[PDB]
């Protein structure tokens, strides 16, 4: 499968999540995603084909994971935006007030700005600390998906937020959305990964 940020993957033929970013670890290909999406050794599939298994994760506390993929997958330095692409150029962290977009299998590519850093989410499973908050909208299934600036700086992966009864927060004004992402920096160093860029 071609690995692009934002696309759908299923875990152990049940849950769906979105791919974060194509990365490598030595000769191993992989992608970073959300920790809540699967447990170590869960099987990830893209379009019905097996592409890899979860190598590691942290959830709750943090919300991160990386899947190592088989040799046959194609890693790409891109994030889906409809039928087009955002090229990944690095991982400089943007500050509060910067514009940012996120891509994921449920609401597609949505943009907005960062409103706060170091936010704690109280999930049913336990607190997730250190999250960055944006007001781009998102829905169930977007988790693990890419957060990136128009300029190509990867910011993190979708963790969660406040969804209404329709499964997303896109029908509530930007001023009321809380959309939370796990910063990418610490996931790259924690796992020794390198981002693929173009």
């Amino acid at each position: 499968a071609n690995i692009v940020g934002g696309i759908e993957y299923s875990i152990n033929n049940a849950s769906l999540c979105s791919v974060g970013f194509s990365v490598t670890r030595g000769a191993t290909k992989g992608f970073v995603t959300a920790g809540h999406c699967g447990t170590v050794n869960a099987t990830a599939r893209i379009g019905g084909a097996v592409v890899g298994t979860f190598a590691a994760r942290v959830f709750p506390g943090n919300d991160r994971a990386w899947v190592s993929l088989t040799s046959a997958q194609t890693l790409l330095p891109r994030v889906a935006n409809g039928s087009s692409f955002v090229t990944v150029r690095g991982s400089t962290e943007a500050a509060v007030g910067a514009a940012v977009c996120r891509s994921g299998r449920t609401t597609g590519y949505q943009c907005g700005t960062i409103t706060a850093k170091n936010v704690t989410a109280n999930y049913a499973e336990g607190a997730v600390r250190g999250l960055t908050q944006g007001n781009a909208c998102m829905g169930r299934g977007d988790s693990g998906g890419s957060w990136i600036t128009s300029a190509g700086q990867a910011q993190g992966v979708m963790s969660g937020g406040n969804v209404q009864s329709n499964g997303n927060n896109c029908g509530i004004p930007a001023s009321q959305r809380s959309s939370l992402f796990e910063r990418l920096q610490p996931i790259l160093s924690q796992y020794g990964l390198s981002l693929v860029t173009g």
Binding site: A34, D63, A121, G141, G160, G161
Partner: peptide
């Protein structure tokens, strides 16, 4: 808040 919910994960996703």
């Amino acid at each position: 808040a919910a994960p996703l």
